[PDB]
Design a protein around this ligand. Structure first.
Ligand SMILES: O=C(O)/C(O)=C/C(=O)c1ccc(O)cc1Br
Ligand SMILES: [Mg+2]
Ligand SMILES: [Mg+2]
Length: 699
């Protein structure tokens, strides 16, 4: 067989060769003891890994039959009875140490990209610094009304509104003692503080401490760096430029620190179903931790006059492993059982990250000596304990000190939401953030209460009582554990990549709730979301909330049951079957784990496996209570399958041959058998069908 024999494992050759030729050299770990640890850890941990998965199926099975009989008094008592709801520990504080300042202190956007896409990943690590002019001019933040519409050449009417918008931002972030940046006619620093020239007057910063440094001669600085809320603002002064020649202070651009941290993703935004897929990922992740990823390059750090100092130039990177559910046949055991993909990610992504700790690739990742892993889709504290013990064992195999691997706990399952304090206590010496995964969180809420009744519509979940408590309950728990100045309190993702006007308008709510950070789709959306953290003082908002328990158990357990006309239904099912179809074609046919599919209302939504978990779970729920039928679902399936194809070279249509499309027939499975996946997860059906398409295409 092609696989390579090591203890009780048969490792696919391509993985085995990658780890030996690319990963291990540099880490001073002997390739034979490394594989010995791998075989040993896997054999050690697979049992209670599988035990925990059975506990999900068991706890769930109790809930399902409960609702086909049975109103929160009996319910809450029954959940704590069966071990779902567990006791709350005593108040405590996290002890995680040696964490980069990006996570303990700075507040600001958090970006997520698929790690299998290298040029995206390059742009994301490069996204710690972003032009504000390009994000304002490039999007709908400036309305494309009047004579300010983007064209094939640069539009100057639009250009000055960019400048005026940024001039205002400068006024509301770094105030002058008297006057406005819009009437600014010169910049210079004389005797250590910057003097801004005005028409008649000359004024300085109201707080002269927000001056951080500059480029060029202090006479005619090529730029001036400013700080506010720990976030850096660079004004590039070069009147040579096209934009510089027009601006009344020679200003070329306004650059904001944008992507403070990025999350390189191995889970819901990627398709990776055999050992060849994971190694493109792993190779990209290795390319980043070395600092030699190219397609062009990672950018270097930036230097300033204060003498000279220097700032980070790339976004500090996390990785997101997969959770505890899926297996992957990149490794099989002697009788053929696929090995748990969560354990593989920890060993392999961990080993790789030793390179992002040294320079001999040239570029360092963590300056405090930590490795940052996000663990999605945990179900309770005991699942957190296991991830901890798993990381502790990987550390031994890899020879690094205990607790180098830190956790990014994802509050995206119901059983961790109501036991959140127990969860963070479990990781208490490794946690570096908690984050409301509200899409994954919504799919669990539906699948957990599937037998309770018909669910409210998808749009309506945004305002349901459970969700609102869930968002405030997380911030409560974080601050009560010491997260301020220690660990990020993080919130969820803006999916609408073309509505930056609405994003700039409404996403301010998240930092106003005390979020240290929130998730972004793009380097551009990251820059705009950064405007929100110059407005709101996240650190001050956090202190106004400590103690304030604005949420109880009963608000978290309120199930979004409904109580609709035959227009509101046919519009929901069609809407759903369209975003399911449009995501799954690119998923099954091309191994693309994230795509922008316009919903029914011509809104470009960025989909992943969480959003598809909500959609398919939803129809699934409406089918189980007879809101609609199987043939009605099939109708909307066939109704829209022509539409995504015109909405979509080297691509495969779906209509009229619905039987002969593994992508179409997968989407149909995802709904019609939707209810029977463990916790409504979508990896099984997607992984079996992705591998199927490959198998046909190889014949
Ligand atoms: O809230 C969650 O479930 C969470 O973890 C976020 C995502 O997984 C995600 C959702 C949509 C999207 O377009 C990109 C992503 Br990265
Ligand atoms: Mg999620
Ligand atoms: Mg302030």
């Amino acid at each position: 067989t092609d696989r390579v024999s090591v203890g009780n494992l048969r490792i696919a050759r391509v993985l085995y060769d990658f780890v030996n030729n690319e990963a291990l050299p540099g880490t001073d770990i002997d390739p034979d003891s490394f594989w010995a640890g791998v075989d040993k850890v896997v054999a050690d941990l697979t049992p209670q890994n599988q035990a925990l998965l059975n506990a999900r199926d068991e706890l769930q099975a109790q809930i399902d039959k409960w609702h086909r009989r049975r109103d929160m008094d009996a319910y809450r008592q029954f959940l704590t009875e069966i071990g779902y709801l567990l006791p709350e520990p005593d108040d405590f504080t996290i002890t995680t140490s040696g964490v980069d300042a990006e996570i303990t202190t700075t507040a600001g956007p958090q970006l997520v990209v698929p790690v299998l896409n290298a040029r995206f990943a390059l742009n994301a690590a490069n996204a710690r610094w972003g032009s504000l002019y390009d994000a304002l001019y490039g999007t709908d933040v400036i309305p494309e009304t009047d004579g300010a519409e983007k064209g094939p050449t640069y539009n100057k009417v639009r250009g000055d509104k960019v400048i005026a918008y940024a001039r205002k931002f400068l006024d509301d972030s770094v105030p002058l003692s008297s006057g406005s940046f819009g009437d600014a006619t010169g910049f210079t620093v004389q005797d250590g503080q910057l003097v801004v020239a005005l028409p008649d007057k000359s004024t300085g910063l109201a707080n002269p401490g927000q001056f951080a440094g500059y480029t060029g001669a202090a006479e005619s600085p090529t730029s001036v760096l400013l700080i506010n809320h720990g976030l850096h603002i660079e004004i590039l002064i070069d009147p040579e430029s096209q934009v510089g020649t027009t601006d009344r202070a020679g200003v070329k651009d306004v650059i904001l620190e944008s992507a403070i941290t990025t999350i390189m993703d191995f889970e819901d935004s990627v398709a990776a179903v055999d050992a060849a897929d994971k190694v493109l990922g792993y190779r990209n992740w290795l390319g980043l931790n070395k600092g030699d990823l190219a397609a062009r390059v990672l950018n270097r750090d930036r230097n300033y006059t204060a003498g000279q100092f220097t700032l980070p130039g790339r976004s500090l990177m996390f990785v997101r492993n997969v959770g505890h559910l899926m297996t992957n046949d990149a490794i099989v055991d002697t009788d053929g059982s696929e090995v748990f993909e969560g354990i593989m990610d920890a060993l392999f992504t961990g080993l790789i990250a030793i390179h992002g700790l040294k320079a001999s690739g040239p570029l360092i990742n963590s300056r405090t000596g930590s490795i940052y892993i996000v663990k999605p889709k945990m179900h309770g504290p005991a699942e957190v304990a296991f991830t901890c013990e798993l990381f502790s064992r990987v550390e031994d195999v890899l020879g690094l000190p205990q607790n180098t691997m830190k956790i990014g706990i994802m509050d995206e399952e119901r059983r961790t939401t109501v036991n959140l304090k127990a969860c963070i206590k479990a990781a208490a010496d490794r946690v570096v953030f908690i984050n409301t995964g509200f899409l994954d969180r919504t799919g669990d809420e539906i699948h957990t209460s599937m037998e309770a009744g018909p669910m409210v519509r998808k749009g309506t979940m945004k305002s349901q009582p459970w969700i609102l408590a869930y968002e405030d309950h997380n911030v409560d728990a974080g601050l009560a554990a010491g997260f301020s100045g220690r660990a990020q309190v993080g919130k969820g993702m803006w999916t609408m990549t073309e509505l930056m006007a609405d994003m700039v308008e409404t996403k301010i709510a998240q930092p106003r709730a005390g979020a240290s950070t929130a998730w972004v789709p793009s380097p551009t959306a990251a820059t705009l979301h950064a405007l929100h953290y110059h407005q709101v003082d996240v650190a001050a908002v956090q202190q106004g909330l400590a103690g304030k328990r604005r949420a109880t158990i009963e608000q978290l357990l309120t199930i979004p049951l409904a109580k609709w006309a035959p227009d509101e239904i046919r519009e929901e099912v069609d809407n759903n079957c369209q975003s399911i179809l449009g995501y799954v074609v690119r998923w099954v046919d091309q191994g693309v784990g994230a795509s922008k599919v316009p919903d029914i209302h011509d809104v470009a939504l960025m989909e992943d496996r969480a959003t598809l978990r909500i959609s398919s779970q939803l129809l699934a729920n409406w089918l189980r209570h007879g809101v609609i039928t199987s043939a009605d679902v099939r109708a909307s399936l066939e109704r829209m399958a022509p539409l995504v194809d015109r909405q979509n070279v080297a691509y495969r249509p779906m209509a009229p041959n619905f039987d002969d499309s593994i992508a179409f027939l997968a989407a149909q499975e995802l709904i019609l058998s939707g209810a029977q996946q463990p916790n409504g997860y979508t990896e099984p059906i997607l992984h079996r069908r992705r591998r199927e398409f490959k198998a046909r295409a190889a014949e």
